[PDB]
């Protein structure tokens, strides 16, 4: 269905700055944050591919001002097994 | 023969983009098609083996979806890629000339001149046709894309002479080395108007 | 589509000549056809894109009109003119083989032998056929002219064994080098007579 | 045409053996073919001029019949000859993909993987399809033999992913140098399941 | 029981990308994901061995471009004690 | 009645490869096997002479790849005492 | 049915180690063993073609350590007459 | 099930000597011997792995004097298909 954008920041503060600049800068929807422990947290946005691809190039230039960014990545199509198994906010 | 229209009804989203790829193989060609439809939800128009053994891929979609599928398809094709084409907004008069090789039976009476243009690949033909429609008020009459005539592809525009010369100025630089021969016939005879290929 | 008959109707003038142009560029094909109909009013039979991208122009009229249109067509084309043919009097058995390749489905009772012959260009096939069957009592059965077989054109004659060997001699004289491979059969197999391409 | 069936009817002798010839001439097609029919009583399935100007011969019969017809064919040919094949027992699924290109448009719901593969000649594609259907429980969906795409020939096999891996191993055994390219699609998009060439 | 593929990466973004590439490039069935703390996460797929030896082989290509691949390993048929006493999805 | 063809292999796997190759490359009917002790195992095909002389010429070519072939032979028309006494499937 | 794997060992012990390492390194079914006299025995496994294709090349690597290995070969799909004539575990 | 050890000796006398040394030098359960023609015979003991793993490497030393000991092996846990489908002592 909808696409996927992920920002992984080493620190909570850079993740909140990324997840705020994305929802301000484009028409995306923040739907939660994944804690892995050790210092890494991941903000996850969902929209169509014209939205998250434009939001993450604002989120990454935001989160490279207050901290360290691990791996910005955009998945334009989540497959139904990943969408049903991993906590991506669109699991039915 | 219904997903080729320039506009959909209200229930369907409008898909103005165009992603075409002409490849020298078919196996890598259809793996390229599979990866392009994996990466983004591109409404694929057609996937067909045209003459001189090439594979012709066309897809509609929104602009970002087709551009995502084109970067994935251009990733997988690199080699067996021959030509590509990505249009953000195809002209409305183009859409009924892609799949069916359509020739015209008769013109209008105020139609003065004609210009016929042939390109070695097919994406050069569609590229130059869509560039020439969006730069001069010409009318596309017929267009043959690599079936029968061994890979090559041509089309003819018509209209007023100044418009077809301006379209010639655009096509002889938008094509490049892929042009073959372009004829600005100023006044075709009454025996040949409207019926050029028969 | 009654323009491909041997004799014209009673309300029509006699048109015995035949002029054939085989070109490499299709756009120059319609240009040369336009200019040849601008100069002298030859009744244009066909302007068709055939495989390996060639373009066939065939015009018909009296001998002088076709001659003058063909000399205009010579000077306009030059240099993507591949081959040229001017016949003052095409033979009567020829005119129904030029639209679509008619294949032989059955033969006569005493069809003694059959001879198959191909040329690389369609113009040499028509020239060698028309030179053959005016100088022998052979009957032309089938003839394919570059549609779907990428440029080459073949045809088969039948009749007496001495007659088809004399027709082989006159084809091999009147073609020279464009003849690719001619093949004689003294006695075709009874499992194969008539049903020749299937 | 019902001669392309796999098994013969009950009032007919059993003819499993097949022989394909691919020739760079059409006159040699008739000469090689009627020499083969003169040598042994083989049922000749098809003698067809297909694209890139080549000629395609398929003959059917018992084992020694087809072997003797092919040995007379390959001694009478040389020197226009492109490829030969003489199979003693073609697989039962193969027989209905020889007359015309039959595209497949509906896979099964448990159809997992597809291997699409093209070869430059024709006999390599038929040899590869037979040698892959014998070695794995795969189902041949569609196949095109040299018409429309200038001599090259392709086919797609479907089934279990491990079975199409083994079939890819055996196709890579039997082609070697005639293989153009091969694609082991592991799990295609749902928009390409069956509706594949369109 | 069935065969086993697993991709461990240092980063949740790399694990979502690897899971997408696995379940798109083959026919596996993603049973979940395992967290071990310190940013190490492991995506776990099942199936026959033919699907998973291509699934993880494509997931390693799509996970070296984003995160950091810890270990790609494919177990053909694990012992029933392993799926009895490890969170691998195939508890009887 | 029908013609006879045989493959003798040191090693059971070579005989099974020869039997599969003979029944796949041509149309014959594998009737059984004879294990004469000491490892010499012999596959026997029964079919009309033109078919078995094409079957065994592939059976030898496949069976030499995996083992050692003792003998390959095709009898075009065995006498009725041979099928009546030696056990080759056509036993009345 | 399914594909076929075999390991030919001059020796019972190489057969048992081979038929242990085959069935541990895939999901195969050891249908049993075949004795042809003179020490040439044959462990015969059945199962899907990637499974047996891994299984026999694990069993050969674990069986050449102790004994002579004559033949190891995988038939990807045996013909129906091969199972119907030879005692290969899948004879209906 | 239980661990396994086996001595294949060319010759009956070396097999009986190895069986003597195995069932005296440890606490195993000799389930007998398999003969495959040509003189190759395999004595099979079956017990816990600490017993058989020393019993076989005492029996090899004690029966190398009389016979050419072909193969010596210990399997610490044979799989259920080996026990169920091969005659190794604990057929269910």
Swiss-Prot record, chains A, E, F, G, H:
By its UniProt entry, which CDD domains does this protein fall under?
A: BMC_CcmK_like
Changes seen on gene knockout: Absolutely required for BMC formation; when deleted from an artificial operon (Hoch_5815, Hoch_5812, Hoch_3341, Hoch_5816, Hoch_4425, Hoch_4426, Hoch_5814) being expressed in E.coli, no BMC shells are made.
According to its UniProt entry, the protein is used in biotechnology as follows:
Artificial BMCs can be made in E.coli by expressing (Hoch_5815, Hoch_5812, Hoch_3341, Hoch_5816, Hoch_4425, Hoch_4426, Hoch_5814) or (BMC-H (Hoch_5815), BMC-P (Hoch_5814), and 3 BMC-T (Hoch_5812, Hoch_5816, Hoch_3341)). Cargo proteins can be targeted to this BMC. Artificial BMCs can be made by duplicating this gene with a 16 residue linker between the copies (making an artificial BMC-T). The shell assembles into balls with holes where the pentameric subunit would be, and can be used as a model to study assembly and permeability.
Kindly list the cysteine pairs connected by disulfide bridges.
none
Keyword terms, alphabetized: Bacterial microcompartment
**InterPro entries per the UniProt record, alphabetical:** Bact_microcomp_CS (IPR020808), BMC_dom (IPR000249), BMC_shell (IPR050575), CcmK-like_sf (IPR037233), CcmK/CsoS1_BMC (IPR044872)
Q: What is its main location?
A: other
Q: What positions does the domain BMC occupy?
A: 3-87
Transmembrane region(s): none
| Location within or outside the cell | Bacterial microcompartment
Cited Pfam families: BMC
A single cellular component GO annotation: bacterial microcompartment
Q: SUPFAM superfamilies, from UniProt?
A: CcmK-like
Function, as annotated? The only hexameric shell protein in this bacterium, it forms the majority of the bacterial microcompartment (BMC) shell. Expression of 5 proteins in E.coli (BMC-H (Hoch_5815), BMC-P (Hoch_5814), and 3 BMC-T (Hoch_5812, Hoch_5816, Hoch_3341)) forms a 40 nm artificial BMC with a molecular mass of 6.5 MDa. There are 60 BMC-H hexamers per BMC. The shell facets are 20-30 Angstroms thick (a single hexamer layer), with 1 of BMC-T trimers protruding to the exterior.
The entry assigns this protein to a family as follows: Belongs to the bacterial microcompartments protein family.
How this chain assembles, per its entry, is: Homohexamer with a small central pore. When purified protein is examined by atomic force microscopy it dynamically makes uniform patches about 35 Angstroms thick with hexamers in the same orientation. In the BMC the concave side faces outward, with the N- and C-terminii exposed to the cytoplasm.
Protein name as it appears in the record: Bacterial microcompartment protein homohexamer
Q: Which organism is it from?
A: Haliangium ochraceum (strain DSM 14365 / JCM 11303 / SMP-2)
From Swiss-Prot, chains B, C, D:
Under the heading Gene3D superfamilies, the entry gives: 3.30.70.1710
- How does gene deletion manifest? Required for efficient BMC formation; when deleted from an artificial operon (Hoch_5815, Hoch_5812, Hoch_3341, Hoch_5816, Hoch_4425, Hoch_4426, Hoch_5814) being expressed in E.coli, a >10-fold decrease in BMC shells is seen.
What applied role does this protein play in biotech?
Artificial BMCs can be made in E.coli by expressing (Hoch_5815, Hoch_5812, Hoch_3341, Hoch_5816, Hoch_4425, Hoch_4426, Hoch_5814) or (BMC-H (Hoch_5815), BMC-P (Hoch_5814), and 3 BMC-T (Hoch_5812, Hoch_5816, Hoch_3341)). Cargo proteins can be targeted to this BMC. BMC-H can be modified to place its N- and C-terminii in the interior of the shell (called CPH). Fusing proteins to the C-terminus of CPH allows targeting of cargo proteins to the lumen of the organelle composed of CPH, BMC-P and BMC-T1.
The record's subunit annotation is: Homotrimerizes to form a pseudohexamer. Unlike its paralogs BMC-T2 and BMC-T3, the pseudohexamers do not stack. The concave side faces outward, with the N- and C-terminii exposed to the cytoplasm.
Entry comment, domain topic: These proteins have 2 BMC domains which evolve independently of each other, giving the term pseudohexamer to the trimerized subunit. Although the homotrimer fills the approximate space of a BMC hexamer protein, the BMC-T trimers are more compact. Their universal presence in BMCs indicates their structural importance. The homohexamers form pores of at least 5 Angstroms in diameter.
| Organism of derivation | Haliangium ochraceum (strain DSM 14365 / JCM 11303 / SMP-2)
Q: What is this protein called?
A: Bacterial microcompartment protein trimer-1
- Site, Gating residue: residue positions: 48
Name where it's found: Bacterial microcompartment
Name the segments for region: Disordered.
1-16
**Entries under Pfam families matching the protein:** BMC
Q: Which domain of life is it from?
A: Bacteria
Query: What is the similarity comment for this entry?
Result: Belongs to the bacterial microcompartments protein family.
Q: What is its main location?
A: other
| Ranges of residues in domain BMC | 17-99, 113-197
Please provide one cellular component term from the Gene Ontology annotations of this protein: bacterial microcompartment
Q: Which UniProt keywords apply?
A: Bacterial microcompartment
Function, in words:
A minor component of the bacterial microcompartment (BMC) shell. Expression of 5 proteins in E.coli (BMC-H (Hoch_5815), BMC-P (Hoch_5814), and 3 BMC-T (Hoch_5812, Hoch_5816, Hoch_3341)) forms 40 nm artificial BMCs with a molecular mass of 6.5 MDa. This protein does not form stacked pseudohexamers in the BMC. There are 20 BMC-T pseudohexamers per BMC, composed of mixed BMC-T1, BMC-T2 and BMC-T3. The shell facets are 20-30 Angstroms thick, with 1 of BMC-T trimers protruding to the exterior.
